[PDB]
Symmetry: C3
Amino acid sequence: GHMKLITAIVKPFTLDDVKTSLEDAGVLGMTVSEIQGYGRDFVPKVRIEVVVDDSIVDKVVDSIVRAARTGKIGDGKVWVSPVDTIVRVRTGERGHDAL
Amino acid sequence: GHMKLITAIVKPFTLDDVKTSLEDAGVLGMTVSEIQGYGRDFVPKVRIEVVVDDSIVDKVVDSIVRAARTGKIGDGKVWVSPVDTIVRVRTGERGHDAL
Amino acid sequence: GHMKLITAIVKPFTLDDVKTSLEDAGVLGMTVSEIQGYGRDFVPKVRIEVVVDDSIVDKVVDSIVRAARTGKIGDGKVWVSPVDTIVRVRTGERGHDAL
């Protein structure tokens, strides 16, 4: 309903900076996956995902963008998509309790 | 329209159990990808995805959660997101025919 | 709003053909990830993602399907899902400027 997935495709060396920015803002539950995207033909990148309430989606996106920017080609993209429902596996908590 | 993507981020050793639970319930077409998430700092996890009709989304989510739960930290998350359209590559079947 | 994510799970040897089809049609920004799906039990596949305006989503899906088809089991799936917002990291461009 109010839940959003943020997907960031960014350079691998920006991971610590993005993670720090998320954790400092109390944004928990990030995952990271390997991915290939255009750069200086493909270069290795990382796919960072978090699920957040829409109240913070704008500032979280901006924080990721700021932390991942180098000003060079291949810096990547950040997009937002709807999440209908979310469940925390361990507890069975749903919605905002699962965040 | 009525189509949903289920994404489950779960511990790698739960894969067979989740797969069995899906296949027993006639939920076909699962994919698996490598992913890293918080656990006992990141631990290896797996990303399991299926596309289903919304008629079964709730019970499929619950079946995955039950199969992947250990009661320990890092058990992961399951979320649902909308799918506008789906096409089976081999046949060009769309919508419910592609499920 | 009008933005869509196309996700294609296809056989790895079709990557060049899909990439060529996308680039020839001026569809930029594709990413590729490793994935496992059903085939001749799992076989290696690739996950190809692009973000496009909904004006071209149908023809882009069809172009990917045509390029990835072999007529054999395991050819994969292509699905479409909504994208609320997108930002190009390097520039901070949003929406259609980030495409």
